[PDB]
Design a protein around this ligand. Structure first.
Ligand code: ADP
Ligand code: ADP
Ligand code: MG
Ligand code: MG
Lengths: 414, 300, 7, 71, 363, 178, 167, 372
């Protein structure tokens, strides 16, 4: 008989492991690896050669953050794997320790961001096909699986196959318009500004103002401040004024534990309540290359799709990923989008001569019960169908053509 | 991780979560989690007939028939008590935890629930340990089909227990590296003054497999462990069972880590060859000093 | 220094 | 525009966060459901929605009499 | 005698003016750089930038002081010196592939551009319209035209090709000059005629050159062979097969002796014996120089111990690609200039070279 | 989304160089007229400062934007000196003696924005611009010394001295980082 | 080594009989400048492909042209382990084919590795040093693969000792 | 390639430059001045802290404080002031765009390099840094991979033996005895003649007297008996106010303290015996290669005739068959910096940085993992 396919959604800040056919990932670990690192001289490809069996003395996931004598490395940066040695070791413990899957009896469904270079896919195919020897692989785009995770929380008869998926993870934020089940790939947008940029901005804010934060935790604090006291503001300068004139109400206190002497430190959370998420509607706060808000990027995405599929795309904007769990994020997004759309419609009516008043475009932003792991569940659907075993790259295909079998994805033509 | 572990993580995690939700007094939610393990084992944790108060953990194995033989459930019964119930349709063993009658110290039953496969294996294996302890020669010797193309022939004598693994790997690269990993397996007895006699053979099957249906062929390797009464006593048989159980999976695991090991040496040698090529690029006369980003220096 | 010598 | 709340805090453990946050009043560990039934139900409901979206849209087959009618 | 390295990138082609005080080179890009001899050092005086692709042929007419440049943009330009700047006049070549070589005629009334379109373009002037026009010689050619050299009677034209053949066409233009006088090559000379076609079928022809008197045509092949066809002997071919790497350029320093160079980076000398009809390896012209070694500093020792864990005994460190005659003409030469793919420019001397080696006799 | 520009340009506003000589509600001497409405350019600049320091693109639209740019650049200099003080009665003296200190004006070395600021055309315009900038500096320091210092402990509040490292488009009236 | 000395001398002498490259613009397309041995567009700019072999299964195929040389190497592979290691090693060499300027991201069918030296590599980089690099690769590849094999054997022994120690 | 600032910043004098040159771009004494009198002339502009050469020129009205003492940073505010003056005034370069290669003496407290990393990452926001050991850079500058470096700076002296690149970390001998102790000793012994320098502004005068007149005697007792029996060694130096002083016997008594610290009331052995002990702690098969590769550095080894003294002293302690070479180049004072520029200009060194990202996630405890 057949065994369920393994689903491994490898994200920059968190990896979701499971067996296809379930409702939620069996494991959600941090995407980090603790290896023994010491003071050495020479290149990186030369000091990584470990004598004996010392290359198996490493940990991953939750067990890699606890280890205080190991060095913690993150192999994935901005969704693109920058280190393949650490990624191979991470994958081998993901398969042989957590999933406990024999990699020769299970099809694998990995994930990727839209702008993953083809050489990354070729290296992933080389790893899964020659090292782990999987009978089949399928590298699906991350946000396109997040659409089929909003159907579990919406009433019957309004579970559509058309919508704009906004996936904001730890390292990348991408916008994918799906229409009737077909990924409109030539309209996908991809911005490397995401949760971790918010965490760097927040720690730089805290470090310029607060005192008493242990250095070795200056990041771990900026996550607990970001994922707890952060919201979205309707206006920036008005919020600065609201904090200045009535600071006794808007300024909160965060009390953490210094995990060396177990003492407690206390800091004041002020402007970084609303300046964190604001790098979504002002990306220049974290990366001066991008200057375009997320509402305008979504509007460009939808306005580039075919005409008669623009009106349903506005109706089912599905959020996904952790970085979209900010209070009143969807509300401000929908407000800006409604402003843009109504202004465009009124301009078109005025240019027409003033005879017809067209239907106001319904704009809706869908928050659902599965956002934190909306991608994985989507995979758990796709990798549970029969047709799945018809779209995978069989081992024969790799043995015949080579890793170049995995070189194409729906973002580029030919 | 060098040695594979015997306890499954998903079972322990799910059952501990359910027991924390039940002990705090929250209302129980549904659960339906199906997954797999090594050697083609299939687990299913669900509820019996939508009854959200009972959790049934079922397991389907490959040694289907050897566990149904009389006396192959002594260990399972002894360890699981009243949790052992009739198998769920399609599966082979099944435990049933009532979330309202859970005894105190919920850590022990979860630690023994994560080792369901190890316990099903040790139950069909301690039969011969006992056949040898009780001082009886010629006791029953069988072939556990612990996989689908590989076998484990167990035999119990008056003074020893012989375990013959008939093993074969699926992939060609894995076969070629496994020939080495199995040839070099007798060089391990130099690491300990007390290790079971290990014999390797791939020219011809041993004389134990001439009356039995253990898998034989010209692509199969035979690894014979001779466990003596210092490895099968009532105090060191747990470790022996764990090792004999996870031997094949451990060999497969390390065969698949050997490649990720070799890749580092290959990268090192690639860089060493690039350094020999670099002697061909004529050194520039003057370089423009840049910044960490790569922009012009903007100053002297 | 802290103990021994000044620095 | 819309007013904000100063005293809102969704304290959650990192392990609680990995599943969901108190900013979405339903997120977290959900009740396990059958996935194939959901898939087929979504397929059928999308088919039914497409049928009515076609019926309520402009119809080229409107002037041939019968159920279509005469222009 | 000297060696000057203008740049580290190859030099495609170079050209000197009448009094050999200025040189026009190609820096391996679209521009043409005109340097001037100022005492002992060189100083760039002009930059000519009109081409779209890198120039592959420059030629400087001595008497009229007009430069002609052909490049890989399928175009040709004639630069004239207005006051202080060189202004270009575009020539319509009508080719559909990259040009390869250009050569002024001896009388500076027309110029030949060999291109990779399997044609030769004889360009001349139309003062009735101020129109640089061109005619085409394209019949027996089947590949790129690599090298050109004109007969001293302003009509015949030697052309080497990548079709393994050296040919002698007749570039007579009946609207800029009179009917030419009969030469030992043939009495019938209409435009596009074929007076001579070598019998070789191996190796491309990198360089052709007419004699000083226009009675002998010599050429070099990638087959390592140097050949000479004599017209006073029923167009007889004398070949010499060398045992070194091939040659790329050659010239006539006398009516009897040739100076070639190529992928060896040093000039060699050949001689022709008319009383027997056979070439003789006169020998290497350059004396093998001993390149001084330098002690390494600590910054350079570690820089090339981390990064990488002269071999050649001539002036040029890369193959020599073009040889020109500086002073003395082709009847009795005294200085020849070589430019190669190392950006260097070696001004040689025949007297000093003959003095340094006494085993070296110039026929 | 664009930064916060000033909305005080009027078609009858006079120009000095190419900066809007906007009226200011102050007591110091200067060539700028007196304001009757409750908001001058300095109040607007102090209102928009905390937000304008985070943006990294600022399109100059009119001359009032150039005046607001100057004042936003000078608040960053006031903050550097107010960070060291420990009493509002000392902050006021520091702000006075800083406003007196002559900073570079358009068209001189040290001014960060000579490219996008039209220098004076003669000597009279030079003098008027000097006096105008001095008045702006004095009044900005005076108004800011009441914002930075909170009355609970009478020392610079950490909510204003955290913007010492934040530079408006990485420009400053002082030296390059000194 | 000393058993490859005549084979390597012949290969080196054939390498610097080719590698006498020149600049050349294409004939079958307007302004492209492409290596003439890769496109095989014109049959007049292609020299004879010469093979130099030490035995039946170790060889070098050299394909010359007017502005490019393609050198394909078929390396010694004695058994299956050496075949696997040679494949993986050549693959890890191809991965960095922009640091090796003369390398080729895919070997010619039938051969283990392939170098493609155009004329820019002989104008901007030392020619004799490129010849030396090719000959050094051919000298040392067998030794490095044998050391890989010994490393695999040592790994197998260490794994066996790590298992049989717990009993 | 990338341009990386190399900031030696040892005790005594800070020498900063760019990686790839042959000499530090800016060398200035690492001092911080503070006015000690009232300001009465308002309107001329005043500052409350002078740094470097400006503090040296105005030393008449300042209290010069060294932020580093005996190789350890003891006042971090003045250290930040020194670094700010180095970045924005001497080099005039933005520090948030270039890597920084700082140096530290061996066997210093870990809190020193920890706070150094924290300052360089949280104050100046350098994108990457690296903390190297001074003697290793000194060996780089000498262009050899074997030898014992004997670096005698202004606040600390230390020897490091290295063989084929493998530095022996169990034979590194440190000794808190350097130019500042010698300057204080000269201040002490200058009283017996009749001159009294007692304020921190005159210590600079004493340091100039030392580094212009003092030298090392080849045979101490012979030179003492000579200068005590004839006025042929006395030299006259002019103070910055016209006074002239004459020093005789003192000239070689100041540096002699380096070879016998019993003058300063210390128990430790001289620098020659320290180097010999460091050598003798290494294995027997490499000592012969160390003896012929002794390297000096630091500005305290610039005394006339110290190479000959060191050779004559080591030769008396080493077997009569070992050849003792004292490789003292005439650019010894800048050697520690010159080796730095060599190091930061290497290709593989880009893989040894401490990237700002790597620190943002691990705090100051990363320097002990990325830098030995
Ligand atoms: N409730 C929350 N509010 C704000 N940010 C969050 C929340 N939960 C997670 N994040 C941020 O999102 C990132 C993790 O989300 P995830 O979707 O797992 O990204 P990835 O899948 O790329 O790792 C982290 O950077 C985390 O700080
Ligand atoms: N040429 C010299 N001759 C004699 N003494 C010198 C010479 N140069 C420097 N010194 C003395 O050596 C002392 C310390 O050397 P220095 O190079 O300042 O140490 P560091 O390298 O740590 O700054 C200085 O105080 C100086 O007076
Ligand atoms: Mg993600
Ligand atoms: Mg020093």
């Amino acid at each position: 008989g057949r065994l369920p396919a393994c689903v491994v959604d490898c994200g920059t800040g968190y990896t979701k492991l499971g067996y296809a056919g379930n409702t939620e990932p069996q494991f959600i670990i941090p995407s980090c690896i603790a290896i023994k690192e010491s003071a050495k001289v020479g290149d990186q490809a030369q000091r990584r050669v470990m004598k004996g069996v010392d290359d198996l003395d490493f940990f991953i996931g939750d067990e890699a953050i606890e280890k205080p004598t190991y060095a913690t490395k993150w192999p994935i940066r901005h969704g693109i794997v920058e280190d393949w040695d650490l990624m191979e070791r991470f994958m081998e413990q993901v398969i042989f320790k957590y999933l406990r899957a024999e990699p020769e009896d299970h099809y694998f469904l990995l994930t990727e961001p839209p702008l993953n270079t083809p050489e990354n896919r070729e290296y992933t195919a080389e790893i899964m096909f020659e090292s782990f020897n999987v009978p089949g692989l399928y590298i699906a785009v991350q946000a396109v699986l997040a659409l089929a995770a909003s159907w579990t929380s919406r009433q019957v008869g309004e579970r559509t196959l058309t919508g704009t998926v906004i996936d904001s993870g730890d390292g990348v934020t991408h916008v994918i318009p799906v229409a009737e089940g077909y990924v409109i790939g030539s309209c996908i947008k991809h911005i490397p500004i995401a949760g971790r940029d918010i965490t760097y901005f927040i720690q730089q804010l805290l470090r310029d103002r607060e005192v008493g934060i242990p250095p070795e935790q200056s990041l771990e604090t900026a996550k607990a401040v970001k994922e707890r006291y952060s919201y979205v503001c309707p206006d920036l300068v008005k919020e600065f004024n609201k904090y200045d004139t009535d600071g006794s109400k808007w300024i909160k206190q965060y009390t953490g534990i210094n995990a060396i002497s177990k003492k407690e430190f206390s800091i004041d959370v002020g402007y970084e309540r609303f300046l964190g998420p604001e790098i979504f509607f002002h990306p220049e706060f974290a990366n001066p290359d991008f200057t375009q808000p997320i509402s305008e990027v979504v509007d460009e995405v939808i306005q580039n799709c075919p005409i008669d599929v623009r009106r349903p795309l506005y109706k089912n904007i599905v959020l996904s990923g952790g970085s979209t769990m900010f209070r009143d994020f969807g509300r401000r997004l929908q407000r800006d989008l409604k402003r843009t759309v109504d202004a465009r419609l009124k301009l078109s009516e005025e240019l027409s001569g003033g005879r017809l008043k067209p239907k106001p475009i319904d704009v809706q932003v869908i928050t659902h019960h599965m956002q934190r792991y909306a991608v994985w569940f989507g995979g758990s659907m796709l990798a549970s169908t029969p047709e799945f075993y018809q779209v995978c790259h069989t081992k024969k295909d790799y043995e015949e053509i080579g890793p170049s079998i995995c070189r194409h994805n729906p973002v580029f033509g030919v | 991780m060098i040695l594979l572990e015997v306890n499954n993580r998903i079972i322990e995690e799910t059952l501990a979560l359910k027991f924390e939700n039940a002990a705090a007094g929250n209302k129980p939610e549904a659960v339906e989690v199906t997954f797999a393990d090594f050697d083609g084992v299939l687990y299913h944790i669900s509820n019996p007939n939508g009854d959200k108060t009972k959790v049934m953990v079922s397991i389907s194995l490959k040694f289907y028939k050897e566990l149904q033989a009389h006396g192959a459930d002594e260990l399972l019964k002894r360890v699981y008590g009243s949790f052992l119930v009739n198998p769920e349709s399609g599966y082979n063993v099944s435990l049933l935890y009532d979330l309202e009658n859970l005894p105190a110290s919920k850590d022990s039953i979860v630690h023994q629930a994560g080792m369901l496969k190890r316990n099903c294996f040790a139950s069909v294996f301690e039969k011969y340990f006992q056949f040898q302890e009780e001082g009886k020669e010629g006791e029953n010797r069988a072939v556990i089909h612990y996989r689908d193309d590989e076998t484990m022939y167990v035999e119990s004598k008056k003074d020893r227990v012989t375990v013959v693994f008939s093993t074969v790997f699926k992939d060609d690269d894995d076969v070629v590296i496994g020939k080495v990993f199995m040839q070099e397996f007798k060089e391990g007895r130099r690491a300990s003054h007390t290790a079971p006699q290990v014999l390797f053979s791939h020219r011809e099957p041993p004389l134990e497999l001439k009356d039995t249906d253990a898998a034989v062929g010209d692509n199969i390797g035979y690894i014979t462990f001779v466990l003596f009464p210092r490895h099968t006593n009532a105090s060191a048989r747990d470790n022996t069972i764990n090792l004999i159980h996870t031997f094949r999976d451990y060999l497969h695991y390390h065969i698949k880590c050997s490649k990720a090991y070799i890749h580092t040496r290959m990268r090192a040698k690639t860089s060493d060859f690039l350094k020999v090529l670099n002697r061909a690029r004529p050194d520039a006369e003057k370089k423009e000093m840049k910044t960490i980003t790569g922009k012009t220096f903007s100053s002297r | 220094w802290x103990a021994x010598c000044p620095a | 525009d819309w007013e904000t709340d100063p005293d809102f805090v969704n304290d959650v453990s990192e392990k609680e966060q990995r599943w969901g946050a108190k900013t979405v009043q339903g997120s977290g560990h959900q009740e396990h459901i059958n996935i194939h039934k959901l898939r087929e139900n979504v397929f059928q409901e999308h088919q039914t929605l497409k049928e009515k979206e076609l019926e309520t849209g402009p119809k080229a087959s409107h002037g041939y009499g019968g159920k279509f009618g005469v222009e | 005698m000297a060696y000057h390295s203008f740049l580290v990138e190859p030099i495609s082609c170079h050209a000197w003016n009448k009094d050999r005080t200025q040189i026009a080179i190609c820096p391996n890009n679209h521009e043409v750089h005109i340097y001037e001899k100022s005492g002992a050092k060189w100083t760039k005086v002009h930059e000519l930038k009109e081409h779209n692709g890198q120039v592959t042929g420059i030629d400087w007419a001595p008497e009229s002081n007009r430069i002609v440049t052909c490049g890989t943009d399928r175009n040709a330009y004639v630069w004239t010196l207005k006051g202080r700047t060189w202004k270009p006049t575009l020539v319509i070549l009508r080719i559909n592939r990259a040009a390869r070589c250009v050569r002024w005629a001896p009388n500076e009334n027309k110029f030949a551009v060999g291109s990779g379109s399997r044609v030769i373009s004889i360009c001349y002037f139309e003062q009735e319209n101020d129109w640089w026009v061109c005619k085409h010689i394209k019949k027996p050619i089947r590949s790129t035209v690599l090298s050109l050299d004109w007969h001293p009677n302003n009509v015949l034209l030697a052309a080497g090709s990548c079709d393994f053949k050296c040919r002698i066409f007749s570039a007579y233009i009946k609207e800029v000059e009179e009917r030419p006088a009969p030469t030992p090559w043939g009495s019938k000379m209409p435009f596009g005629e074929l007076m001579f076609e070598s019998s070789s079928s191996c190796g491309w022809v990198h360089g052709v050159c007419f004699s000083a008197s226009g009675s002998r045509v010599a050429w070099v092949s990638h087959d390592s062979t140097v050949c000479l066809a004599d017209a006073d002997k029923k167009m007889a071919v004398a070949t010499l097969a060398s045992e070194t790497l091939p040659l790329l350029a050659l010239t006539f320093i006398t009516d009897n002796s040739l100076v070639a160079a190529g992928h060896d980076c040093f000039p060699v000398l050949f001689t022709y014996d008319a009383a027997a009809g056979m070439l003789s390896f006169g020998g290497r012209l350059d004396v093998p120089k001993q390149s001084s070694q330098r002690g390494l500093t600590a910054r350079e020792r570690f820089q090339n111990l981390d990064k990488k864990a002269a071999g050649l005994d001539s002036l040029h460190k890369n193959s020599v690609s073009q040889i020109s005659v500086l002073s003395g003409g082709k009847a009795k030469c005294s200085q020849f200039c070589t430019t190669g793919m190392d950006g260097g420019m070696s001004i040689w001397d025949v007297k000093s070279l003959e003095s340094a080696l006494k085993d070296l006799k110039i026929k | 989304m664009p930064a916060y520009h000033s909305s005080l340009m009027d078609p009858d506003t006079k120009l000095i160089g190419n900066m809007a000589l906007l009226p200011i509600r102050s007591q110091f001497k200067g060539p700028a007229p007196r304001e009757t409405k409750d908001t001058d350019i300095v109040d607007e600049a102090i209102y928009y400062f905390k937000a304008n320091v985070f943006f990294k693109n600022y399109e100059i639209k009119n001359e009032a934007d150039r005046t607001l740019i100057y004042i936003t650049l000078y608040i960053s200099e006031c903050l550097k000196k107010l960070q060291k003080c420990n009493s509002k009665s000392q902050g006021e003296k520091e702000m006075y003696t800083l406003g007196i200190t002559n900073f570079p004006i358009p068209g001189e070395p040290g001014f960060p924005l000579n490219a996008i600021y039209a220098k004076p055309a003669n000597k009279q315009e030079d003098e008027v611009m000097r006096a105008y900038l001095q008045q702006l500096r004095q009044e900005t320091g005076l108004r800011l010394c009441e914002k930075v210092f909170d009355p609970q402990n009478d020392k610079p509040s950490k909510w204003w001295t955290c913007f010492v490292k934040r530079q408006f488009m990485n420009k400053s009236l002082s030296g390059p980082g000194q | 080594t000393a058993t490859l000395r005549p084979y390597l001398s012949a290969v080196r002498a054939t390498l610097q009989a080719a590698l006498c490259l020149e600049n050349f613009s294409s004939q079958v397309v307007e302004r492209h400048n492409k290596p003439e041995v890769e496109v095989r567009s014109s049959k007049e700019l292609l020299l004879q492909p010469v093979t130099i072999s030490r035995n039946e299964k170790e060889k070098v195929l050299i394909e010359g042209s007017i502005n490019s040389v393609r050198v394909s190497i078929a390396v010694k592979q004695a058994d299956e382990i050496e075949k696997i290691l040679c494949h993986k090693f050549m693959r890890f060499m191809m991965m960095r084919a922009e640091n090796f300027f003369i390398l080729r991201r895919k070997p010619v069918e039938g051969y283990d590795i392939s170098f493609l030296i155009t004329n820019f590599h002989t104008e901007q980089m030392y020619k004799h040093k490129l010849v030396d690099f090719v000959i050094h690769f051919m000298e040392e590849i067998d030794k490095e693969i044998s050391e890989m094999k010994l490393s695999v054997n040592a790994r197998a022994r260490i794994v066996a000792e790590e298992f049989l120690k717990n009993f | 390639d990338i341009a990386a600032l190399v900031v030696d910043n040892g005790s005594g004098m800070c020498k900063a430059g760019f990686a790839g040159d042959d000499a530090p771009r800016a060398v200035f004494p690492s001092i911080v001045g503070r006015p000690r009198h009232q300001g009465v002339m308002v309107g001329m502009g005043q500052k409350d802290s002078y740094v470097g050469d400006e503090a040296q020129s105005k030393r008449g009205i300042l209290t010069l404080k060294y932020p580093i003492e005996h190789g350890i940073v003891t006042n971090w505010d003045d250290m930040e002031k020194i670094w700010h003056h180095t970045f924005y005034n001497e080099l005039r370069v933005a520090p948030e765009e270039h890597p920084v290669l700082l140096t530290e003496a061996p066997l210093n407290p870990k809190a020193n390099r920890e706070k150094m990393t924290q300052i360089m990452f949280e104050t100046f926001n350098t994108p990457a840094m690296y903390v190297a050991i001074q003697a290793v850079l000194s060996l780089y500058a000498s262009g050899r991979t074997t030898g014992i470096v004997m670096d005698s700076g202004d606040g600390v002296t230390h020897t490091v033996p290295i063989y084929e690149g493998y530095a022996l970390p169990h034979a590194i001998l440190r000794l808190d005895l350097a130019g500042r102790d010698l300057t204080d000793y000269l201040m002490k012994i200058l009283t017996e003649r009749g001159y009294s320098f007692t304020t921190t502004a005159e210590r600079e005068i004493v340091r100039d007297i030392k580094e212009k007149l003092c030298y090392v005697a080849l045979d101490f007792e012979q030179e003492m008996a000579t200068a005590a029996s004839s006025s042929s060694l006395e030299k006259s130096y002019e103070l910055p106010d016209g006074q002239v002083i004459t020093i005789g016997n003192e000239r070689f008594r100041c540096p002699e303290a380096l070879f016998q610290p019993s003058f300063l009331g210390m128990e430790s052995c001289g620098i020659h015996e320290t180097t010999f002990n460091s050598i003798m702690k290494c294995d027997v098969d490499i000592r012969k290669d160390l003896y012929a590769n002794t390297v000096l550095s630091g500005g305290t080894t610039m005394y006339p005739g110290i190479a000959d003294r060191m050779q004559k002293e080591i030769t008396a302690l080493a077997p009569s068959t070992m050849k003792i070479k004292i490789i003292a180049p005439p650019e010894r004072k800048y050697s520690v910096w010159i080796g730095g520029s060599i190091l930061a200009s290497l290709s593989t060194f880009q893989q040894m940085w401490i990237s700002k990202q790597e620190y943002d996630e691990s705090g100051p405890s990363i320097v002990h993992r990325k830098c030995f």
